[PDB]
Design a protein around this ligand. Structure first.
Ligand SMILES: [Zn+2]
Ligand SMILES: [Zn+2]
Ligand SMILES: [Zn+2]
Lengths: 694, 216, 30
């Protein structure tokens, strides 16, 4: 509530962006002027072809210096961020001067007080003088991107204008190309054959890297840009930190009846060359990522924002959750269910009742009742969800109405359907599984059943490519990659006439039988010098799409019975995994940030401060199976939601007056745990390990 | 090893501080050896940390009270005897104009000029509390680093290697930009764009601010 | 230590610097 320079600068930049958007909307109506303007309004002027060219030259002349200002500032900021990222991977992480150190957190520096003002300015000035002549080695640069809000509005306006003008086989087969969920705009994707799996798709090798705050770059590989050496400024990679040097390069590369109105087509030309917004987005990728991270609440609220279009997990999950809440509160039809705690009668009653209920849906609430057990809270539905998940994922038999439904293709913790000579019972079971996942997505709960990436991509309606096979079976993915890499060797037929593979494959026991051909005419066509890409793509689409087409279609129809075709649009496999299955493993930091610590004992042992520390040390020193049993004792679910908005009751630990006689009690429907205050840390640990087993 | 060079060893062979201070309690820099047992109250001077304790677990303590080099009590101190001064200067004169050992830094990444100017800036503060009249304690404080600086600064190899330090054709073993051959080509470009000026700035600061007793 | 042991109820008054990633945390303040 005080006067500041930055507030006025941001407000003036917002006004400038509004006027630039209006100018863009006015210039976009020129080729359809006589249809949209000179057919409805009684008063309009006459527009010729040469006047549009004069207007385009006028506008391109009057937006030069702000363009130079923005491009110089963004180039210097991207150079500083890229040098910081380069120095982060070449230095010692144990040093306090490393970028990935705990001392570099801004919130940790404020909490540590409970350096001087001269030293901060002296370090800023010393970083300013060293950056002029490229003398800034082994020093982290001093900058604040959060004070650059007025630059982002001008950048957004100019990208809006550029985007508005722009929009107005063997190896080169569309099976080995990544989709939009794994590429970067304006950047060259990595080679799928010459790069091993450890540094191309690190999410396939390490599935535990999926976090709600995880970046895209460390999950799908490092992109590259082919910009070096070329005389224009936009064709050279920005490596200099100085604003003056970048401004010098920008200016030096700067000053280095007729046709009908329908045929007018503007072209973007600032610096003597055609400019696309894709290479501008790829040129400043780190700055755009940080701008989307820190400037979403105000800069990202503008109409036609490029930060919202390039949003991550938190942008899409909020929109999906509010649409789910609106569609849930739109109708008032309830669903009731009665089950019992076993396997066979549980799955039989589930199939019967889920067939009887709409044998799109408009389910408002879901109520579950256990037979010969009390309880009517919201945690009973979560207990039913984890019970039906562990019942479907278990491997004993098929409980009448024969193969087990799911199997693991080679990665632990992920499942794909087994066809097993599909009758009407298996298809109805898969439709029921899809409807169960649909109601779990609708009711804001977590169903602990985990599918592979291609299984999720079939449900969402996305094309399966060669890179999805790494999430199916990684070792033979690597073996086939080495087979492609050796298929282009200089010896050629020397390695081809060694094993003499054919176009028939021996399937495993779960997939079916064996000796199944890929192409017509069967085994009599061996591997030629040039057929290997075709053999790989037929093998991949046979093992991912041909064997289990009917269960995937049944699950897609079951998911579409509850959810419409307007919510799965602009969703990905990873946020589908994060919204249904949660975060997977259980961490300590989010569980710390979710708790409330209600106090009702009234006891003042050093104002507590030691029982809570002992409790969190007990949780941090606990095995993950016991952690999942702990979380099952909180809210009757083995997994945590991805964010705070997945908890309709907030989590709560509530202390009690001290009594060393009873185990802590659980109220599942309000997500509360009443714990009595104890004395010894070992006593607390023993009581917790005895309470979690139940 | 870079700490076994004859020029560096010849520069850091100074007279031990017990030879010019007896049982007094002057203000010095205090080092601790885990190997030799100089732990609680037994201490040693800086020349002990240089010549003595070279491969040991010797560290510098920040909370340093006054001490008087209890190095001869626990081990055989190699710095109690000073050699011939004129032959030492003649050896420095001959080694400066015949070899290329002045362009090689030591194991701490320091040039010879930076080490000499830091020794001069330390000895100017430490040597002003000398009062003129078990080992012998009746010798003067050592004055060799001033003459060594005056000789080394009269050379267009040492000044060139000191001022052009951190450039492309000069490798510092304790810098993150020295070993970048296993990284991506874009990161190598970003790391090879810049040049290092930390040690040059430290040398200039130690020459100008910390040496307020001479102009020569 | 330094990490808080409970929720702070988000305290309002946010500048967005806490939403920065771990790799780019040295480039933001407050
Ligand atoms: Zn020792
Ligand atoms: Zn000594
Ligand atoms: Zn000694």
């Amino acid at each position: 509530n005080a006067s500041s320079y930055l507030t006025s600068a941001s407000s003036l930049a917002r006004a400038y962006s509004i006027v630039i958007r209006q100018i863009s909307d006015l210039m976009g109506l020129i080729p359809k002027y006589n249809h949209l303007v000179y057919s409805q309004i009684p008063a309009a002027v006459k527009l010729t072809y040469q006047d549009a060219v004069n207007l385009q030259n006028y506008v391109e002349e009057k937006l030069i210096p702000t363009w130079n200002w923005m491009v110089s500032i963004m180039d210097s900021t991207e150079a500083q961020l890229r040098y910081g990222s380069a120095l982060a991977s070449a230095g010692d992480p144990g040093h306090p001067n490393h970028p990935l150190h705990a001392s570099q957190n801004s919130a940790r520096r404020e909490r540590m007080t409970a350096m001087s003002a001269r030293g901060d300015f002296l370090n800023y000035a010393l970083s300013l003088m060293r950056s002029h002549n490229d003398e800034h080695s082994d020093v982290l640069p001093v900058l604040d991107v959060c004070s650059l809000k007025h630059v982002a509005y001008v950048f957004q306006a100019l990208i809006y204008w550029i985007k508005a003008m722009n929009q107005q086989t063997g190896q080169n087969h569309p099976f080995f190309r990544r989709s939009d969920s794994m590429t970067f705009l304006g950047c060259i994707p990595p080679n799928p054959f010459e790069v091993p799996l450890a540094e191309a798709i690190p999410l396939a090798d390490q599935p535990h890297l999926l976090q709600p705050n995880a970046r895209k770059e460390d999950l799908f590989g490092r992109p590259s840009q082919g910009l070096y050496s070329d005389r224009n400024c936009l064709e050279v990679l920005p490596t200099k930190m100085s604003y003056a040097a970048n401004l010098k390069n920008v200016m030096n590369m700067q000053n280095r009846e007729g046709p009908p109105l329908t045929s007018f087509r503007p072209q973007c030309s600032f610096m003597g060359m055609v400019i696309s917004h894709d290479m501008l987005l790829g040129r400043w990728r780190l700055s755009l990522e940080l701008f989307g991270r820190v400037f979403m609440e105000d800069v990202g609220a503008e109409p036609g924002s490029i930060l919202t279009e390039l949003g991550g997990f938190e942008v899409k999950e909020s929109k999906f959750r509010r649409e789910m809440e609106k569609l849930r509160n739109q109708q008032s039809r309830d669903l009731s269910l009665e089950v019992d705690r076993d396997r066979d009668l549980l799955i039989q009653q589930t199939m019967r009742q889920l067939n009887n209920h709409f044998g799109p849906m408009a389910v408002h609430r879901v109520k579950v009742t256990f037979k010969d057990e009390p309880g009517e809270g919201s945690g009973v539905a979560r207990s039913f969800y984890t019970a039906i998940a562990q019942a479907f994922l278990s491997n004993e038999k098929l409980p009448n109405l024969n193969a087990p439904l799911f199997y693991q293709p080679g990665k632990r913790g992920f499942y794909t359907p087994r066809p097993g000579k599909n009758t009407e019972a298996r298809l109805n079971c898969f439709r029921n599984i899809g409807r169960i996942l649909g109601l779990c997505l609708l009711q804001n709960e977590l169903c602990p059943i985990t599918l592979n990436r291609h299984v999720i991509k079939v449900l969402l309606g996305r094309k399966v490519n060669w890179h999805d096979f790494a999430f199916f079976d990684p070792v033979m993915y690597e073996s086939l990659r080495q087979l492609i890499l050796a298929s282009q060797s200089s010896d050629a037929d020397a390695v081809f006439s060694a094993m003499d593979l054919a176009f028939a494959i021996d399937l495993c026991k779960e997939e079916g039988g064996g000796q199944v051909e890929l192409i017509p005419n069967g085994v009599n066509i061996p591997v030629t010098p040039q057929n290997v890409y075709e053999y790989v793509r037929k093998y991949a689409e046979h093992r991912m799409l041909v064997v289990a087409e009917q269960p995937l279609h049944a699950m897609r129809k079951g998911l579409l019975d509850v959810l419409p075709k307007n919510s799965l649009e602009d969703l990905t496999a990873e946020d589908f995994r994060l919204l249904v299955n949660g975060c997977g493993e259980v961490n300590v930091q989010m569980l710390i940030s979710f708790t409330s610590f209600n106090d009702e004992s009234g006891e003042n042992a050093e104002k507590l401060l030691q029982f809570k520390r002992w409790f969190w040390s007990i949780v941090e020193k606990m095995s993950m199976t016991e952690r999942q049993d702990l979380v099952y004792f909180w809210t009757s679910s083995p997994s945590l939601p991805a964010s705070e908005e997945g908890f309709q009751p907030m989590p709560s630990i509530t202390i009690r007056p001290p009594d060393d006689q009873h185990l802590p009690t659980a109220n599942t429907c309000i997500s509360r745990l009443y714990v009595p205050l104890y004395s010894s840390k070992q006593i607390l640990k023993q009581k917790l390990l005895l309470a979690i087993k139940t | 090893n870079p700490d076994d060079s004859p020029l560096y060893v010849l520069c850091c062979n100074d007279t031990c501080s017990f030879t010019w201070t007896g049982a007094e309690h002057i203000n010095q820099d205090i080092f601790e050896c885990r190997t030799c047992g100089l732990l609680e109250s037994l201490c040693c001077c800086t020349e002990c940390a240089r010549v003595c304790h070279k491969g040991h677990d010797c560290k510098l303590k920040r909370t340093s009270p006054t001490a008087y080099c209890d190095c001869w009590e626990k081990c055989k101190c190699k710095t109690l005897i000073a050699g011939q001064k004129s032959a030492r200067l003649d050896l420095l004169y001959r080694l400066l104009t015949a070899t290329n050992l002045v362009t090689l830094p030591n194991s701490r990444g320091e040039h010879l000029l930076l080490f000499l100017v830091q020794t001069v800036a330390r000895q100017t503060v430490e040597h002003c509390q000398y009062r003129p009249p078990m080992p012998d304690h009746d010798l003067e404080p050592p004055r060799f680093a001033q003459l060594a600086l005056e000789r080394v600064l009269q050379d267009w190899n040492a000044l060139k290697s000191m001022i052009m330090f951190g450039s492309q054709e000069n490798k510092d073993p304790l810098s993150a930009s020295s070993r970048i051959g296993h990284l991506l080509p874009e990161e190598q470009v970003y790391l090879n764009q810049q040049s290092g000026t930390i040690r040059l700035d430290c040398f200039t600061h130690c020459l100008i601010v910390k040496c307020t007793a001479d102009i020569l | 230590l330094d990490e808080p042991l409970e929720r702070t109820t988000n305290s309002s008054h946010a500048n967005g610097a806490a939403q920065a990633p771990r790799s780019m945390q040295w480039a933001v303040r407050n």
